[PDB]
């Protein structure tokens, strides 16, 4: 169970998905197309 962890802007949360484009999924973090995990994302404007 590999748990990756980071922060991103809100209009780019849709780019954390298998096979996506845009300046996060191209070269910051690329999910494979053989994906079987679970992407969890929540707002943290009250902290970060």
């Amino acid at each position: 169970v590999y748990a990756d962890s980071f922060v991103i802007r809100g209009n780019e949360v849709s780019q954390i998905a298998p096979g996506q484009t845009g300046n996060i999924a191209d070269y910051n973090y690329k999910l494979p197309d053989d994906f079987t995990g679970c992407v969890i994302a929540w707002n943290s404007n009250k902290l970060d």
């Binding site: 298998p18 096979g19 996506q20 484009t21 197309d33």
Partner: protein
Amino acid sequence: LSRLDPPEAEVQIDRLITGRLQSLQTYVTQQLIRAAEIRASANLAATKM
């Protein structure tokens, strides 16, 4: 591929593969049925010979 990402290109190519694989199954099944008919004719020709 030239105009589409892999996640979606695998689905589109899999559809074409299934279609053309069905073409081959149709072709080979008919050759077996038709080869039995020419074989029956060759048996008649050998018998007359």
